[PDB]
Amino acid sequence: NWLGGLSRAAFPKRFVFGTVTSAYQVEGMAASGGRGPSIWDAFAHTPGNVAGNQNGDVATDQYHRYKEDVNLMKSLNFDAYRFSISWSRIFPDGEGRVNQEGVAYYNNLINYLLQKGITPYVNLYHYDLPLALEKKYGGWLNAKMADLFTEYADFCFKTFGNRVKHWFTFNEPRIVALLGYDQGTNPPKRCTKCAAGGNSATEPYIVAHNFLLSHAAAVARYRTKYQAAQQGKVGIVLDFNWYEALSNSTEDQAAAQRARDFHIGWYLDPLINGHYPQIMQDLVKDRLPKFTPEQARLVKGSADYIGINQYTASYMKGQQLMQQTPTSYSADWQVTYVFAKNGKPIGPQANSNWLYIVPWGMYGCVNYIKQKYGNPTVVITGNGMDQPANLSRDQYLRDTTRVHFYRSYLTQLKKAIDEGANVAGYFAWSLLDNFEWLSGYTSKFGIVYVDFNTLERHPKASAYWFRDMLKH
Ligand SMILES: OC[C@H]1O[C@@H](O[C@H]2[C@H](O)[C@@H](O)[C@H](O[C@H]3[C@H](O)[C@@H](O)[C@H](O[C@H]4[C@H](O)[C@@H](O)[C@H](O[C@H]5[C@H](O)[C@@H](O)[C@H](O)O[C@@H]5CO)O[C@@H]4CO)O[C@@H]3CO)O[C@@H]2CO)[C@H](O)[C@@H](O)[C@@H]1O
Ligand SMILES: [Zn+2]
């Protein structure tokens, strides 16, 4: 049967199923409703930065259509919705004056979700730093971000936390560090060779450190000021794609483990264990900032659950570890990526070149966190795949590859849960086709098709698959 034996009965009692969007990717009204610009508004409005010079000015216009979209997710039998608050929609300058119209939008959205029995899971940040903070403070290179983010978080807790009980601070800080400060392809476009300036060997580490310190400061504020009354939880969302040793050689096993540590351990060792991974300390040395004992104690245990965005897997080949002149966070890993073993590709690619369809990577990642980190509460906060541009409406709707994707990946997640992994929920990226960053509207991740000419929603086969799977 097309469900492959999956249903709510196949997952733990009270297991949460949801869909996910982010503010800039779906809201629209980017320069309206009092919203100030983010670093992504400036970036996307610069010719050449995004596919087709597209931007999020309108996106899916969820800002006007949110009741349609909430009705849809309820009709598809989801329990929860992960979305983000745009910092610059609340504080157009990132600090100071509150945009009451922006506050009203999120109140209306939260209230409608609750009215319809959908639990809000709310990210405070999803790549969309207020442009004013980038210009005034230098964004995530500045340790002052911990104060600025904490004050923003405090406002959100105060304003929405009587209703919102499930928060995340950040979304995929690794990707901000990597694309914004190593490769320099995402805002602020910093890197060693970059026009904007930068240093690919140092800045990614500074940025990650400031995300960890800012997360910890915001959670300390929640716990000391809001938790007693509100009795909610705050976590963080981290991307983790799987790394599998190419062979059982000591060298290849070491490489796959180094990759895991530089990818997920970079954040999870501080959050769970109060230190960076040993291998990062050993290889990155003076370029890796040091937590003081007090900071480490603030960071350790500061996530009530770990959000994991899981998409793909790679084979890793090793090499003898060498003394080398530092060049980048990426090069520091001293690994070699491989996408075939014994002449066979690890899996077929979705539209995005990086996204190999490898359902056993889901098991790999979840089992690994279970075994390495004392089985922390994990929520799969994003998982999905994309179709390419230029298909017909009907071609988008007949998304049989995505149906197969969800059935296979969820079977692998179930395998890990059945083996004892402490996974509390699962969220599909994305509810809607949306603005896919550098790919603009040329990458379609939704279980619901969005016609970007008319803005009409049409559920795809995968949406109906979820509806059938999730029926109560
Ligand atoms: O995107 C959908 C949705 O999901 C969330 O976040 C996504 C995010 O949007 C993506 O940008 C991001 O993509 C990264 C991949 O996950 C990751 O595997 C990939 O890793 C690269 C690595 O950075 C690079 O060094 C390496 O290059 C080597 C080549 O492979 C070799 O051929 C060559 O010889 O050597 C070079 C250098 O060693 O390749 C690897 C493998 O691709 O980096 C991607 C960044 O482009 O994934 C996120 C989740 O994983 C997000 O929540 C939503 O907002 C978003 O819309
Ligand atoms: Zn509109």
UniProtKB/Swiss-Prot annotation:
The keyword Secreted applies. A beta-D-glucoside binds at Q25, H126, N171, E172, Y311, G382, W429, E436, W437, F445. It is an enzyme of class 3 (hydrolase). Disulfide bonds join C191-C194. Coiled coil: none annotated. The keyword Transcription regulation does not apply. GO terms for cellular component: extracellular region. Keywords: Disulfide bond, Glycoprotein, Glycosidase, Hydrolase, Secreted, Signal. The active site is at E172 (proton donor), G382 (nucleophile). One of its GO terms (molecular function) is beta-D-fucosidase activity. One of its GO terms (biological process) is carbohydrate metabolic process. Its EC number is 3.2.1.21. Glycans are attached at N248, N390. Its main location: secreted. It is found in: Secreted. It catalyses: Hydrolysis of terminal, non-reducing beta-D-glucosyl residues with release of beta-D-glucose. Homodimer. PANTHER family: BETA-GLUCOSIDASE 7 (PTHR10353:SF77), GLYCOSYL HYDROLASE (PTHR10353). Hydrolyzes p-nitrophenyl beta-D-glucoside, p-nitrophenyl beta-D-mannoside, p-nitrophenyl beta-D-galactoside, p-nitrophenyl beta-D-xyloside, p-nitrophenyl beta-D-fucoside, p-nitrophenyl beta-L-arabinoside, oligosaccharides, pyridoxine beta-D-glucoside and the cyanogenic glucosides amygdalin, prunasin and dhurrin. Possesses pyridoxine transglucosylation activity. Belongs to the glycosyl hydrolase 1 family. This is Beta-glucosidase 7. It comes from Oryza sativa subsp. japonica.
